[PDB]
């Protein structure tokens, strides 16, 4: 039972899509079979910040930050695939976790 | 109130003083700032000066007082009417 599984987290969906696309294209080069990417539900968190220094309760900025997630499976991988993926260059703004 | 499984709370510096007074027979008042200590049976018959914010007011402990906090007998606010 060999199946690599990769999870990606980011604050920018364009960057996360770039990384996932490039990862699957790298794996197909070594020739293993790929399932995904599977988009997972996005986390959205929101904050209300008073803008005035002293007193205006109705004057606020509303900010949000989003966490995007992607999941990929590599099934029946060859010997080249594992070290190629581990060699793959890290892109800033994206967190990648690899599990056996 | 404080949970029964924990037992009563008494400040250590007040407890040592009251125990010394009990072991001796001093009639000198004890002087404390510990408004939060609860009156135990050993406190009965003694004189404790409890701070109220500006002065230490004297309290003679009777049998009924046991179970209350010391600060209950030294009010902190002054009111005489409008």
């Amino acid at each position: 039972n060999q199946r690599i599984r990769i999870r990606l987290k980011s604050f920018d969906h364009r960057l996360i899509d770039q990384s996932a696309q490039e990862i699957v294209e790298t794996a197909k080069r070594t020739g293993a079979q790929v399932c995904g990417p599977i988009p997972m539900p996005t986390r959205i968190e929101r904050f209300n910040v008073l803008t005035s220094p002293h007193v205006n309760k109705d004057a606020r900025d509303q900010y949000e930050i989003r966490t995007y997630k992607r999941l990929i499976d590599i099934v029946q991988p060859t010997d080249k695939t594992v070290d190629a993926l581990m060699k793959l260059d890290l892109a800033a703004g994206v967190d990648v976790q690899i599990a056996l | 109130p404080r949970s029964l499984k924990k037992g009563p709370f008494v400040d250590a510096h007040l407890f040592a003083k009251v125990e010394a007074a009990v072991a001796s027979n001093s009639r000198k008042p004890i002087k404390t700032w510990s408004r939060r200590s609860m009156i135990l049976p050993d406190f009965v018959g003694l004189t404790i000066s409890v701070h109220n914010g500006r002065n230490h007011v004297p309290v003679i402990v009777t049998e009924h007082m046991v179970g209350h906090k010391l600060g209950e007998f030294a009010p902190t606010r002054t009111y005489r009417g409008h």
Binding site: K9, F11, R14, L90, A92, G93, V94 | -
Partner: protein
């Protein structure tokens, strides 16, 4: 009469972030605090090197600081010892190994912060305030921007009653979200208090959206 921040409003629309890293919720605060420390340190240390933009990346346990400068010789040093010294100081500050990359601006007059710094320096060098902003406006317009607005506020000329002057030339479409507008602010410290300087520079519209910007 209060205007939204021109970069804040179009962040994530046509403009990217000066910080680009991911962190877990329990590391976000420490990362952000150390990044702010780095910015505050670099501003002071390169006050005289025409630094405009600082970009911070954390790929994995390491930091890449990109400094956009118009005087690369001063920042790098005669032999390149200064970049190493800066790398050591920033490594100490961040607690992780750090590296520095220089990005040279080709046209300083097209940049918002450099122009504001020049106006503020002249104002505390006691040049009459109306000459400095006309000079900056015509310099940028000749450099080839599509518009510029300049504003100065405070005790202009050492007067008792403070006031606000401004001067605009060209196009400055603030409400158009896809417009590419650069903005900066500075403080000039004079004998009679603080004077504030604001600059807007418009350099055409960004077509294709953030898909084209490739965020």
């Amino acid at each position: 009469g209060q205007k939204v921040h021109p970069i804040g409003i179009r962040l994530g629309v046509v403009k990217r972030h000066n910080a680009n890293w991911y962190a877990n919720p329990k590391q976000y605060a420490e990362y952000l605090l150390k990044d702010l420390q780095v910015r505050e340190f670099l501003t002071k240390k390169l006050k005289n090197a025409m630094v405009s933009n600082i970009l911070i990346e954390r790929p994995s346990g390491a930091a890449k600081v990109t400094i956009s400068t118009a005087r690369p010789g001063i920042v790098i040093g005669k032999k390149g010892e200064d970049i190493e010294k800066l790398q050591r100081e920033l490594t100490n500050i961040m607690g992780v190994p750090a590296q520095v990359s220089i990005n040279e601006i080709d046209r300083p007059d097209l940049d918002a912060r450099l122009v504001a710094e020049a106006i503020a320096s002249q104002l505390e060098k006691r040049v009459m305030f109306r000459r400095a902003m006309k000079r900056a406006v015509q310099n940028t317009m000749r450099a080839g921007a599509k518009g510029i607005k300049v504003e100065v506020s405070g005790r202009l000329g050492g007067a008792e009653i403070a006031r606000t002057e401004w001067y605009r030339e060209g196009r400055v479409p603030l409400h158009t979200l896809r417009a590419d507008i650069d903005y900066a602010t500075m403080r000039a410290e004079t004998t009679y208090g603080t004077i504030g300087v604001k600059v807007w520079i418009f350099r055409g519209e960004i077509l294709g959206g953030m898909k084209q910007v490739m965020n």
